[PDB]
Amino acid sequence: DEDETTALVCDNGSGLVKAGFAGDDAPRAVFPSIVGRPRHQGVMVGMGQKDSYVGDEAQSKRGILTLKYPIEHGIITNWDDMEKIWHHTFYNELRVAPEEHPTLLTEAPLNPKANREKMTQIMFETFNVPAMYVAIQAVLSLYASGRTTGIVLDSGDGVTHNVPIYEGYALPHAIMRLDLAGRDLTDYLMKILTERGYSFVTTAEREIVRDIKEKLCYVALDFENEMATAASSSSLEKSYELPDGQVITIGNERFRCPETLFQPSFIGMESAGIHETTYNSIMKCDIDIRKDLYANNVMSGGTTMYPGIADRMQKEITALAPSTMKIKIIAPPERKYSVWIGGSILASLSTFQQMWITKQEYDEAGPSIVHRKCF
Amino acid sequence: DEDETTALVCDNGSGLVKAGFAGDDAPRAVFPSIVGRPRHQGVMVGMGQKDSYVGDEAQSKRGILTLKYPIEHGIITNWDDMEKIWHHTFYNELRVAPEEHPTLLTEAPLNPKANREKMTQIMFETFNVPAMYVAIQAVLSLYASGRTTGIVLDSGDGVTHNVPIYEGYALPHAIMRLDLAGRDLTDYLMKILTERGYSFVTTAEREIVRDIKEKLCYVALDFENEMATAASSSSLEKSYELPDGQVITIGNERFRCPETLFQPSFIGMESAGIHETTYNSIMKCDIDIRKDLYANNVMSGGTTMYPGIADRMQKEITALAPSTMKIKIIAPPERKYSVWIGGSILASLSTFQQMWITKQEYDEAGPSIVHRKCF
Amino acid sequence: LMKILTERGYSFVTTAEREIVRDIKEKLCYVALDFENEMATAASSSSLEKSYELPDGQVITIGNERFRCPETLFQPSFIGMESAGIHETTYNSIMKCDIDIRKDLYANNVMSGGTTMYPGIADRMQKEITALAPSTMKIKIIAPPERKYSVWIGGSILASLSTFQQMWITKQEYDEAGPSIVHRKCF
Amino acid sequence: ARKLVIIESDLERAEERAELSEGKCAELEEELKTVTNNLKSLEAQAEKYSQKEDKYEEEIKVLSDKLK
Amino acid sequence: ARKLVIIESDLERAEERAELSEGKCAELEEELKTVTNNLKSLEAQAEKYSQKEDKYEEEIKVLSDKLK
Ligand SMILES: Nc1ncnc2c1ncn2[C@@H]1O[C@H](COP(=O)(O)OP(=O)(O)O)[C@@H](O)[C@H]1O
């Protein structure tokens, strides 16, 4: 546009595909990372079904679709279907050719080595990308919120990651990975829903569970005191008319499921709560470096949007943590797009040149170019 | 048995509970020092779960158990569970009453003062022990191997201890303690395993990591020369069929983790390597007392069983150590039970009478009897 | 059945006679080991059609009708349900438990119910399971030749136990804890 | 009635062939367990011997230099 | 007629476990021969490595004497 040339920003997860044009502050066309076929055989003739039904077109009509998700936190059940997800991204919504503008993707911390080389194969050899990089999830948001000294816990629907990044990344481990977010809460509901004459059976309607979840469901401050309150039918049940037509008086259902977050013992996992793992990462660093970590805590992700998420942390942490200085948690009121706001940062930096992979660089160091320069 | 009366030998650590009958050369019934409950709620009725699942019975079935270890190198997370570990030792395997035969336990060098009095409370006041002593880990093995003049470095899964004992114990410090052994290597694997589509998540299966580790994993002589060898898929990957059914081609995974031993910089610790700390202890003693220390080096413990453990020491030591006389390291091909073989020694000595604590001695000098006579 | 029966000049319309469909079903209908190999066998009119004189009087030569319907069991895609087969859901439940607790589960599998009485029900499981399951130890499925009354034989057990006292609800217990007595003590 | 007699003649044949195979299969598995035990044992020694000669040649190289 | 089905069904079970056992047993038997050959091969190499490092032991010794 008579400014520069070849530039773009992108970001994908287990919820939405955040992307936009060149030099933007916020996304432009986010869409669900879904994709399925036809369990209904799509009037076979009222088109040769194909196109699994990805994008707004897919999210619009769920019934015909057997929504089979490709990338469940880390593991990619299949790469063949990924081919026609990015074919919908750059060409339909972004309206730009990938054989021109760079690309800034996100990296699920500690992702299988074999996956990186596989992805690069899809871009460089097929979609011809002469410049691109895959930054590491959390570290991005750090520079956006305006923090240089804090501990980041960025996670939404993908995977939980405790990234203590306030003066260095890639160093002692002090990081954790937990497959317990988003889809885990989306699949657990139908189970407990059975006791209330409800059952979102198939995957298509399972996706709706998440929709209603993010508009009412809240977290209990103390399950004990709210157990006796159950008698008082006022703060619990609330009339929610299902778009089609079937009221669901969610009440105790709201604060029962989220309890699993702090208590992973409800789904057969010894994984400690997100406030225990926090200790595990802090106890590794030096002794004279905790007082500043407690001062500011970066809690990001769409998972940190439900009522009663930050106040609970300040109750459990103080217990098994030093009690002398003040403790404050920085949870950006809109901390979901924290990664994208940070993506816009690195997207406009020139120092970033010493990170991405140039067309020729791949052929000069084989497929291992990724893990030979990056880390 | 028409020989003597009241005698026994024992030894516990962060791996196995070594114990036997009276006047034995080798243990008789070793078992893992584990203990957990039921994350599965044990068919609550197909018995009132209780018995955490300790002993062979526990090690047999790991799934139902949430193996929560009590004594992590020095610190005892909880003493209440220790109650029913010794209740399984003397009564089930040893088949002898503790209210008769003495007991020879081991002492983790520099163990909290408050712990000694607490232990004695469990024996004398409850299990009624009229005679017992808690000897100091390393010094025991010295008299077994047949050495009077050497430096001992006894450690397995518990804690690393550099004990320069060749003519006197308890004197200048010249000793070190490092919480970096066994369980440290057992927990670090799952982290790096994530990059290879593997993840031993919970603690139950974490224990297996150690099992496979001690049958293949080896140490790299020189990481640099073995980095290029990686291309040659022959000395690296090896088919290991997981008992259940999931092959794991460990190759570069074998010599990557053990490197942490010599390089504690991979887990955020300024602790110098085991060959630097060796210098730290030698430089304290006199100048004319090193030539004999290098002649013989007592390297004991199950940690000194992996391939490439002794030869590496003779490479790093000679560098920052005097280069004139000959240097030889004595690493008993089976140097794990070195403590027990030495335990059998002190167990048959009568001079040992002027060490242990008699029933009455405790009441005549209060609970401080331990740190009033012993040291 | 009545649905697919329409193509063979038969139709058990109302519910009354619908109940009979189940009666004849449990005396001949079997499950196909492999639909592909049994598709060409259809030409050989010998292992398929079998004369079944309807008590009233109307012969029904069931043959391909026998192993077509049961296929829905392993393939719930024939009735508009994304529900995975009974051998997939098995994985879903096993993958949740610990890793070192599968080798013993495969050793013994309790398949009970009158549904596990039809010909070709246990052997098929040992074909599909081994595929997406660990292949090292031996796998055996325990399907009691009469596994329908398994619940009743077990009922006789708990019926003679005294420990069972700490489970049931006594007359007074209901009035002392209101109607919620059930979900207050039981689970 | 006749078919009831014929069907039994084929049953016993498969049972014996299965038992005969299981007998040898178990023996082969036991033998394999013994061989694989010595295989890794010899491999460990081979690796050790290789480590020895490497250190020897290195020391010998030094002895030659000092000799000259 | 029903008894026939019971026995006929057993024939299918017997035939199935027979061909499956023999199939794997034959595969195992063939594998043992390969493993046995590898054992003999590795053992031979280990013998050559053992006799070699021993030759260095007497070589490094005589050289140490000449150096002294
Ligand atoms: N205000 C909100 N309240 C509740 N959930 C929200 C809110 N905003 C976004 N979400 C949810 O957060 C998820 C996306 O979070 P994100 O951190 O981007 O996930 P991921 O990185 O795993 O793709 C979606 O399920 C979305 O519905």
Ligand SMILES: Nc1ncnc2c1ncn2[C@@H]1O[C@H](COP(=O)(O)OP(=O)(O)O)[C@@H](O)[C@H]1O
């Ligand atoms: N031959 C061996 N090779 C590798 N590891 C071994 C060997 N023998 C024993 N071990 C391991 O050594 C550990 C026990 O060593 P030990 O020195 O007794 O420990 P601790 O004193 O901390 O209890 C266990 O983890 C055990 O599996």
Ligand SMILES: [Ca+2]
């Ligand atoms: Ca993500």
Ligand SMILES: [Ca+2]
């Ligand atoms: Ca110890």
